[PDB]
Design a protein around this ligand. Structure first.
Ligand SMILES: [Mg+2]
Ligand SMILES: [Zn+2]
Length: 2008
RNA sequence: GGUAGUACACUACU
RNA sequence: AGUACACUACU
RNA sequence: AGUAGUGUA
């Protein structure tokens, strides 16, 4: 941890050049890690630190009286010992990831100490403390030791040692001897998976083709390699080395040629520019005109928004019946003649209620009351229309189509030519997007929309989002709050809210619409209506009707049918719209999308116009068509390529960009993109980089400058680069998934697949070539690279085969693998004609391969039941299937993604799944070792990897450039020399691969299989036979696609499908070279990595020819490549290098069969983009807008709480990806609004709970009771929706704890709960506490409990609606048929249930046996929810059903009442009322409050830590986020009590045998003991037994299913208790790098409070608590950390800012009276003295005496006499630094000065400076000399306490005169130009005192000339009289900080001028209490306009005038 | 020409 | 209604 | 363990 020791290790690594000493380096590194952990553990435990203390020594120490030689002490050396309570504990520190060494050392030490334990009559305990370096989880075996130490708070980081190990291994990676020397064990191969290999593989036609393709020597080499057995051979790498040596000549020749190409390359690469963009645009428009039908008519446009809107009418009433009457009258009174005017008038007559409004209301109310009285739908009773006036009414807003009221001809005209009901190869018609008239029409449309919608609403901006989240959003960003207020005031919000409400009403009324009825939908607007036409994927037909007084005052986005005159104005009818419920639901959610988009685009940008942003967002948010889809996604490639250094944007536009402009908005956005391309080319040079700050240990202040110089894209303004990237990339997420149509997408996907297959069949005939032919692989280079990479990878780890089998469950059963037991679909081949009934297709097409789709688990059940599969180890069965399954069949379906063209998705059969599983797991485990591979990297860690690569490339650039240009810089401190100096080049190739799986040479994987060392020859033969049979796979065409292709009746021109299928005579097509998408990810990625390694070699050699330095980092996921190249050379310009690098990148991709997408491949100098993730310049960046937009996404629609928890997930992910707090809060508000809208809980609505509960606002109601979340954003991110209860409890603590403990730790504050008075609690608090006590917890719980259930062990759902829903067909499931047979079997259920009781662990864990699996599969069918999931369900239909059933009795209140002490289903409102009634009778007591606190907070260490962070937080100096970084969330529960896996522990507990398969005998015993203790102390077994007994007695018969359910919850709780370290991968973008839990919490809290700036957070006490997950914590930690921080801060502050002489007196004075963090510093000093950590404060102790020479001896042991020390420190006056020897220096570690604000004490008055305020000073404590000398007199005036000082020179004497540090910045001279700033030791003239002197002189001169009221000067007697007047004035009035700072500044000026005597003699002038003339004088004050004091003097005068006027 | 089972949401500062 | 890589919810 | 959702390729 020590930085000097880190430097020492770095020097050892750098200077080392022998692999024999690198082992010494690594061993020393491991010892340093162990000793560091031991020292930190001893500090935490507060025990004296020892290492390898002799056992005889410890025996003598514990028993000095006994004579030595009484017994031979064992030679073992314990790390440390501890003797308390007559028990000796032998402690051993271990820093390992495993327990093998721990257990063997435990056994050895125990055996060797038994004899001494018996003799000396002392029990000896062997305690092994083990820490896991990668996840800091502590493991302790001795429970007695853990009893001694209840809280162990070891919080340390091992990242430094990992970095050194990585540096050593990368330096000596090329040395195979070093790898062998550091290898663990030898090369070991497990037992062969198969006993025999395929003999028919050699006869396979595919193998014959491959063999004939290869030349003869390669055929021989392939046969030898596949027939090679590593275990039999003397060396495993015998054949690998032979092949590598054979191919070395060709490999070296290829590398040398490719390197020689650098000279032949010119400087001209594919630069994007305006000419290329224009030519590409011309080619694109030509291609689009050829492929489409271009229309120049505006009347051919399609609706941009399927809606028309008009402002409301304040004069008219908003009652529903009045609106209906008004609509009927307006429809009837249409004047004029038109096509449908008579139909509209007839409809208005049909809906004419007349004057019988009361009768209509009564009829509708009676119907609704009848409907709502039943949980189920009312059946068998027919609704009969009632005639009211001329209206035949069936329901509210439902009317008959009366044949008498409408002519038949008019009715058919309307229904067919208008609504399309009863209605009934050319090119798709699209508008001309390049036509000037068409673009002018689009501009006119957008201008009209802006004009109509920019006006004010005229109504209150009050709404749910604002009311419930305005405070949070305002505190986060007042500007965001103001933007929201403006948005809600404008008319865009009213229009989109009206459209959403109206569309929800349309969806509600369309469910029960009949064929002869039409519905009327109404919204809050009294002028906007909807008429829903009859309808039967369900569709909705609606027409929007708008009433407006003035014509042309309507908002028409190309949806209007016509505007007609009526009574009292005009009526406008929109054209009929037919939409899918999926698009309708998006429209309903659209307000959230609109608000999110507007706030994202406007955030932190004053140069943008909110009107323009909303004008764009209203169209993108409501876009539900493919027209905008065709533009959003290609825009990324177009604009990003244009900004790039090298890109083929011209070819991209010409060949791929295909705008689909069916709408005027699409035309407008096409023009926007076109302009943005040229602008992006023009403005690529305005990107600038921040000044890098390098500390040589970490990088801070890195990235890209924030200057708004780039032009905005979609709307006028200026943006930063980050905002520009957001504007480029966010629009892709405006698209909607599932917009495609199955018919067309199946046709296109089949066409693409068959076209690729046909092209491969015809054109592609060569497999191996040397000239980089398309779809061809260079054989020699491939083989050589594969050999090299395989050698390196398998040399890295010696047990690769064992690791594969262990991690992939190869040795375990088939039923224990998730991918083989899932509910995903799989293909089944065979005769299934009966189930499928299709008949016509079967008869008409002979060669039809019959197939059916089934679930994976069902297929596994079938194969197990038919004995095709067994429960033997899975790998043996997999290889058996590799031989048996000769024919592979696949089918495909469309993904339905959000891109313009859908993606084909392939489904395979079970045997193919298993074979590919084996191959892919082998490839995966070899990819894990390779650093370049990125699929093996867990998700979201790729951001951290990108950051690390960028940081090391920055460091390499700086170091290499400085090292090379040292000579030139020395010569400078010449222009000709500067010309010839070396320059740095940085290159980022963000690349894409074209047709990764479609066009790939599958033969290159044969070599990967054959050259693999870890496989046996028989395994290789079987796998190669599988691959050969895979290359003969057949694609089964889908039945629906075949149906449509057979129902055409007109022959297609060139039907590729018919050609490939023999004129539709077969449904199967043979696919050979296209390994199917997604099946061979790891293998393809490995070969991609090998290709990039060859590229790296080529680049390194080529740069070697240039005598330069290069660093190449390549990241490869599957087909997405991120290659960054850093070059520092001087021979040639950068253009030649860029051209050469790009040409060789393309050539290297083509060499290995890959093909880079040059259209989508672009080169940048700074920006990295690997997988939707960006690294701007060392600084991580991500588009969190996608997570922000997914806040309104679909959910399970289970209930109000379940729905909310799903969307808070998206909010939290957005927070993790860098979303600012205000936008995160907006997303949370939108999620709450969406849920409340779904369940009709919005304010004022029926299910709104605010009235029924004692709460002022919905923040007071619990989430489970339908409140809104109220908690800090850091809490929401960390604990995740438990934050509601946590925040409520913390607020209760902060409100009711006594003042003495108010600033104590959470455990102490909870211990003080017994003193609470329950009578003082408010009604809301009482209600919430009762809810927590009785609804969340159990009545049996007692405050005396020591262990209890954690919040993760219990659910939170209370009010969940129930639905009467049919299960579905489920006919095709063989397992379901077996389950039905078993159910119909006599009593089979009792046996199956009995088996599940006998093996209860099967309920929660996977079974390890076929019988166990088959029983579980049969059992799951009992649960209704599983069957519902099995049936396909539409989320759109579920959402509408939840809306409709909101008033029906759905809540089962019996279950809720069963929760507390001791009917029919109930509605939401009645449930609220009943819950309040039930809770009224219950009582609450201090005992109950203690139970709540103990069971909610004291259980979880994470909950305790979060509560401590909230209570004890101190917020420091604000600062702008300069350089961000990634940091993963650490583990909050470090202590581990269970070692074994939870499944194994549960299996052992179900039985009583600690000895289980795969379970360590003795290790499982303690886990079983712990689990039994947990069960007994929580009384789970007793509670379950009592519950089942009571239920059995109540029912009268044994409810066996109830017993199963009880066992399920019991084992669920047991599983949650015994769950081990999950170690989730959760990374965060944070202002700084965090290493420990406290650092992470500080960074989270400081980052998630304000949008503008982030704060430094330190904690008053120690936040972390040492405890276990389910054990109560009643012990708080010590204050030693506070003492350490205090005295480190004190020593270093005194050294830095105090003169050498005054330092000791300063220390003594501050020790005597001051206090740190509410703790007296004398007490902290006593803690340090009377403690076992005194070697960290040797200089501090020396200055205060102490030492006693024991500390010096201990320090020497860590590596010196007292008098020698005293003599040596004669010249040194440093409090923090002392010299024990002539060169040895004992020092105290530094602490950040931001914590100095925690010191409180009496003033330290010396000279005129009061040092207390200096410690409290914020500006003047900075270490940099420049920053100190450049501070202001406003800050400096705080330190002035003169009381009669004459000279500032003697006043400032009490300041440090040692040299300070200053930041010197230098340029780098690289193609991306940037400056690095590094602090360096300054010379003598720059000291703290000198900086203060310069500050004083400059600022006082400025202030003097600012306040020379008289012309003579500052010292003139008249000016002095004016100063006397002003000081008397300010003394006479109330003190203000303006007055104080002005007084201090004038005082310091007078001290400089030596006017102090009169200053202290200032009094009221004799000419002056005439307040009138004081006012006259101050109003006559000649205030100057000097800029710093201009605002200051005016404010001071104004405040004085206001105060003196308020006085009178 | 005839036929076309199918119980309910919003109801608002507008 | 697929492979993989995750994350978060509910039972 | 099952189910749902989201992001990624
Ligand atoms: Mg890419
Ligand atoms: Zn003074």
């Amino acid at each position: 941890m020590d930085y000097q020791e880190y430097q020492q290790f770095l020097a050892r690594i750098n200077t080392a050049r022998d692999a024999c000493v690198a082992k010494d380096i690594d061993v020393d590194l491991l010892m340093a890690r162990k000793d560091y952990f031991g020292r930190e553990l001893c500090k935490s435990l507060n025990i004296e630190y020892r290492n390898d203390v002799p056992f005889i020594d410890i025996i003598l120490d514990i028993r000095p009286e006994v004579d030595p030689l009484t017994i031979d002490a064992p030679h073992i050396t314990p790390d440390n010992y501890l003797y308390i309570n007559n028990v000796l504990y032998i402690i051993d520190y271990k820093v390992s990831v495993s327990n093998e060494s721990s257990v063997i050392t435990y056994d050895k030490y125990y055996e060797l100490t038994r004899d001494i334990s018996d003799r000396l009559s002392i029990p000896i305990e062997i305690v092994i403390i083990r820490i896991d370096p990668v996840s800091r989880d502590l493991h302790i075996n001795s429970d007695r030791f853990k009893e001694l130490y209840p809280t162990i708070v070891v919080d340390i980081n091992f990242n430094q040692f990992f970095d050194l190990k990585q540096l050593l291994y990368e330096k000596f990676g090329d040395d195979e001897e070093f790898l062998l020397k550091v290898a663990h064990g030898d090369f070991t191969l497990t037992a062969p998976w198969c006993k025999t290999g395929c003999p028919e593989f050699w006869k396979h036609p595919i193998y014959k083709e491959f063999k004939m393709s290869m030349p003869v020597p390669e055929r021989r080499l392939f046969e030898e390699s596949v027939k090679f057995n590593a275990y039999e051979s003397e060396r495993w790498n015998t054949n690998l080395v032979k092949i590598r040596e054979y191919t070395k000549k060709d490999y070296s020749e290829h590398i040398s040629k490719s390197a020689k190409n650098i000279f032949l390359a010119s400087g001209f690469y594919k630069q994007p520019n305006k000419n290329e963009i224009s030519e590409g645009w011309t080619l694109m428009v030509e291609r689009v005109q050829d492929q489409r039908e271009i229309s120049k008519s505006l009347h051919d446009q399609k609706p941009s928004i399927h809606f028309i809107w008009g402002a409301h009418n304040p004069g008219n009433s908003n009652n529903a019946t009045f609106k209906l009457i008004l609509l009927s009258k307006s429809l009837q009174s249409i004047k004029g003649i038109s096509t449908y005017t008579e139909a509209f008038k007839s409809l208005g007559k049909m809906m004419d209620i007349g004057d019988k409004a009361i009768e209509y209301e009564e009829f509708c109310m009676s119907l609704k009351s009848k409907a709502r009285s039943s949980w189920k739908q009312i059946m068998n009773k027919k609704l009969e229309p009632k005639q009211i006036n001329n209206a035949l009414v069936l329901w509210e807003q439902q009317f008959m189509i009366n044949n008498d009221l409408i002519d038949k001809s008019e009715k058919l005209k309307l229904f067919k030519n208008f609504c399309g009901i009863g209605k009934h190869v050319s090119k798709p018609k699209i508008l001309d997007f390049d036509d000037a008239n068409m673009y002018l029409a689009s501009l006119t449309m957008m201008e009209q929309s802006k004009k109509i919608l920019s006006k004010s609403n005229g109504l209150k901006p009050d709404n749910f989002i604002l009311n419930e989240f305005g405070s949070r959003i305002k505190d986060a960003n007042k500007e965001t709050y103001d933007n929201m207020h403006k948005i809600f005031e404008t008319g865009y919000w009213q229009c989109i809210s009206d459209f959403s409400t109206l569309m929800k009403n349309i969806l509600s009324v369309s469910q029960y619409n009949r064929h002869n009825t039409f519905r009327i939908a109404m919204c809050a607007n009294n002028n906007v209506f909807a008429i829903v036409f009859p309808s039967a994927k369900a569709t909705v037909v609606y027409s929007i009707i708008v009433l407006h007084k003035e014509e042309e005052n309507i908002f028409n986005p190309g949806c209007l049918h016509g505007t007609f005159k009526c009574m009292n104005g005009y009526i406008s009818i929109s054209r009929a719209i037919r939409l899918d419920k999926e698009r309708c639901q998006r429209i309903v959610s659209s307000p959230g999308l609109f608000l999110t988009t507007c706030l994202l685009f406007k955030h932190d940008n004053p140069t943008l116009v909110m009107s323009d942003i909303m004008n764009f967002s209203i169209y993108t948010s409501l876009s539900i068509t493919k027209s905008v889809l065709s533009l959003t996604e290609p825009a990324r490639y177009m604009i990003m390529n244009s900004l790039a250094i090298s890109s083929n944007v011209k070819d991209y536009i010409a060949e791929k960009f295909s705008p689909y402009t069916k709408t005027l908005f699409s035309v407008y956005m096409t023009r926007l993109i076109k302009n943005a391309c040229f602008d992006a080319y023009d403005q690529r040079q305005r990107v600038q980089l921040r000044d890098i700050y390098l500390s040589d240990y970490d990088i801070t202040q890195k990235g890209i400058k924030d200057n708004r110089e780039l032009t905005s894209i979609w709307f006028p303004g200026s943006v930063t680069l980050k905002e520009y990237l957001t504007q480029i990339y966010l629009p892709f997420y405006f698209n909607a998934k599932g917009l495609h149509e199955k018919h067309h997408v199946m046709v296109d996907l089949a066409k693409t697949i068959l076209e690729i297959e046909c092209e491969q069949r015809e054109n592609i005939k060569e497999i191996w070539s040397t000239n980089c032919t398309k779809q061809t692989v260079n054989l020699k280079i491939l083989i050589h690279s594969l050999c090299k990479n395989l050698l390196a990878d398998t040399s890295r780890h010696n047990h690769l085969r064992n690791r594969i089998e262990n991690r992939n469950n190869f040795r375990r059963s088939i039923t224990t693998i998730s991918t083989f037991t899932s509910s995903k679909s799989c293909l089944k081949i065979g005769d299934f004609r009966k189930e499928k009934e299709y008949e016509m297709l079967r008869n008409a097409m002979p060669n039809y391969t019959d197939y059916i789709s089934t679930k994976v688990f069902d297929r596994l059940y079938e194969l197990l039941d038919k004995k095709v599969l067994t429960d033997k180890p899975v790998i043996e069965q997999i290889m058996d299937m590799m031989i048996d399954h000769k024919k592979f069949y696949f089918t495909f379906f469309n993904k339905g993604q959000k891109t313009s063209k859908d993606r084909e998705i392939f489904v395979g059969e079970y045997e193919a799944k298993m074979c590919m599983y084996a191959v892919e797991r082998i490839a995966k485990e070899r990819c894990k070792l390779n650093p370049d591979e990125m699929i093996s990297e867990p998700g979201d860690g790729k951001l951290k990897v990108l950051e690390q690569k960028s940081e090391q490339e920055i460091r390499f650039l700086v170091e290499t450039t400085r090292q090379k240009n040292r000579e030139i810089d020395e010569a400078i401190e010449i222009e000709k020399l500067s010309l010839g100096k070396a320059k740095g080049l940085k290159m980022e190739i963000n690349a894409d691969m074209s047709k990764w799986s479609a066009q790939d040479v599958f033969y290159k994987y044969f070599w990967l299989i054959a050259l693999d060392p870890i496989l046996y020859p028989q395994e290789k033969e079987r796998i190669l036979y599988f691959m050969c049979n895979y290359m003969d796979k057949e694609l089964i065409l889908p039945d629906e696609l075949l149906f449509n292709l057979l129902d055409q009746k007109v022959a297609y021109q060139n039907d590729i499908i018919a050609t490939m299928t023999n004129q539709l005579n077969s449904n199967t097509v043979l696919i050979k070279r296209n390994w199917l998408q997604g099946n061979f990810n790891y293998t393809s990625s490995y070969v991609h990595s090998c290709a990039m390694s060859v590229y790296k070699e080529i680049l390194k050699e080529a740069i070697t020819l240039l005598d330069g330095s290069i660093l190449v980092n390549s990241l490869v996921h599957s087909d997405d490549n991120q290659t960054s190249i850093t070059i520092v050379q001087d021979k040639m310009e950068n253009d030649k290098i860029i051209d050469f690098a790009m040409k060789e990148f393309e050539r290297a991709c083509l060499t290995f069969g890959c093909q880079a997408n040059m259209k989508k491949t672009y080169v940048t100098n700074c920006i990295k983009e690997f997988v939707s993730l960006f690294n701007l310049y060392g600084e991580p960046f991500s588009i969190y807008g996608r997570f922000l937009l997914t806040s309104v996404g679909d959910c399970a629609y289970i209930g109000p709480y379940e729905d909310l928890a799903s969307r808070i997930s998206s909010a939290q992910t957005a927070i993790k990806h860098g979303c600012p707090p205000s936008l995160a809060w907006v997303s949370i508000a939108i999620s709450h609004w969406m849920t409340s809208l779904t369940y009709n809980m919005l304010p004022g609505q029926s299910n709104d709970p605010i009235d029924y509960f004692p709460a002022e606002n919905r923040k007071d109601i619990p989430i489970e009771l339908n409140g809104v979340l109220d908690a800090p954003l850091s809490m929401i991110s960390t604990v995740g929706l438990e934050s509601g209860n946590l925040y409520f409890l913390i607020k209760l603590l902060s409100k009711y704890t006594p003042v003495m403990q108010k600033r104590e730790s959470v455990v102490n504050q909870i211990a003080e709960v017994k003193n609470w008075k329950v009578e003082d609690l408010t009604d809301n608090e009482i209600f919430r506490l009762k809810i927590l006590r009785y609804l969340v917890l159990d009545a049996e719980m007692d405050p005396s409990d020591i262990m209890g259930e954690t919040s993760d062990m219990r659910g939170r759902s209370i009010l969940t609606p129930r639905k009467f829903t049919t299960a579905g067909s489920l006919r095709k499931l063989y397992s379901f048929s077996k389950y039905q047979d078993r159910l119909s079997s006599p009593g089979g259920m009792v046996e199956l249930f009995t088996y599940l009781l006998e093996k209860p662990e099967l309920l929660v864990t996977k079974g390890e046996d076929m019988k166990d699996y088959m029983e579980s599969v049969i059992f799951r069918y009992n649960s209704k929810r599983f069957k519902e999931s099995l049936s396909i369900q539409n989320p759109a239909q579920l959402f509408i059903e939840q809306i409709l059933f909101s008033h029906k009795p759905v809540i089962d209140f019996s279950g809720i009442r069963d929760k507390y002490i001791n009917l029919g289903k109930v509605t939401f409102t009645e449930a609220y009322r009943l819950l309040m009634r039930d809770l009224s009778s219950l009582e609450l007591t201090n005992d109950d409050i203690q139970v709540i606190y103990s069971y909610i907070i004291l259980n979880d260490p994470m909950m305790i830590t979060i509560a401590n962070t909230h209570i004890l937080s101190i917020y420091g100096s604000p600062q702008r986020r300069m350089g961000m970084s990634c940091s993963t969330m650490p583990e909050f529960r470090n202590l581990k009590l269970i070692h074994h896996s939870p499944a194994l522990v549960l299996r052992a507990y179900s039985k009583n045998n600690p000895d289980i398969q795969g379970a360590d005998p003795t290790e499982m015993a303690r886990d079983l003991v712990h689990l039994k203790e947990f069960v007994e102390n929580t009384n789970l077994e007793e509670k379950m037994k009592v519950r089942i007994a009571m239920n059995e007695a109540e029912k009268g018969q044994r409810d066996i299913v109830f017993e199963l359910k009880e066992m399920t919850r019991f084992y669920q709780v047991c599983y949650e208790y015994v769950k081990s370290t999950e170690h989730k991968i959760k990374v965060f973008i944070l202002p700084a790098k965090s290493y420990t839990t406290t650092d992470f919490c500080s960074l989270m809290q400081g980052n998630l409070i304000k949008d503008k700036e982030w704060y430094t957070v330190h904690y008053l006490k120690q936040i972390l608590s040492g405890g276990h997950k389910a054990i109560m914590q009643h012990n708080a930690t010590s204050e030693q950390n506070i003492a350490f921080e205090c005295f480190k801060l004190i020593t270093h502050f005194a050294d830095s800012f105090i003169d050498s002489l005054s330092r000791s007196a300063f220390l003594q004075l501050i020790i005597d009276e001051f206090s740190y963090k509410d703790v007296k510093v004398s007490k902290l000093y006593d803690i340090i003295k009377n403690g076992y950590n005194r070697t960290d404060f040797i200089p501090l102790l020396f200055r205060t005496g102490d030492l006693r020479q024991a500390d010096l001896d201990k320090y020497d042991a860590m590596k010196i006499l007292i008098r020698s020390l005293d003599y040596l420190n004669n010249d040194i006056f440093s409090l923090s630094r002392i010299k024990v020897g002539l060169d040895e220096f004992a020092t105290i570690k530094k602490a950040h000065f931001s914590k100095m604000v925690s010191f409180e004490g009496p003033p330290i008055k010396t000279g005129l400076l009061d040092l207390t305020e200096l410690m409290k000073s914020q500006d003047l404590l900075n270490l940099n000399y420049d920053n100190i000398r450049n501070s202001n007199l406003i800050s400096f005036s705080k330190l002035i306490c003169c009381e009669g000082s004459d000279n500032i020179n003697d006043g400032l004497e009490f300041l440090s005169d040692d040299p300070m540090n200053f930041t010197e910045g230098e340029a780098i001279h690289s193609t991306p130009i940037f400056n690095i700033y590094y602090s360096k030791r300054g010379e003598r003239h720059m000291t703290y005192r000198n900086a203060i002197k310069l500050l004083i002189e400059r600022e006082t001169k400025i202030f003097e000339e600012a306040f020379t009221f008289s012309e003579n000067g500052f010292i003139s007697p008249e000016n002095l009289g004016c100063l006397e007047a002003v000081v008397s004035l300010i003394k006479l009035l109330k003190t203000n900080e303006w007055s104080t700072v002005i007084d201090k500044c004038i005082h310091i000026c007078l001290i400089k001028n030596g006017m102090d005597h009169m200053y202290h003699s200032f009094d009221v002038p004799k000419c002056f209490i005439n307040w009138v003339m004081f006012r006259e004088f101050i109003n006559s004050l000649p205030g100057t306009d000097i800029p710093p004091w201009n605002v200051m003097t005016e404010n001071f005068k104004k405040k004085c005038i206001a105060l003196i006027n308020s006085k009178f």
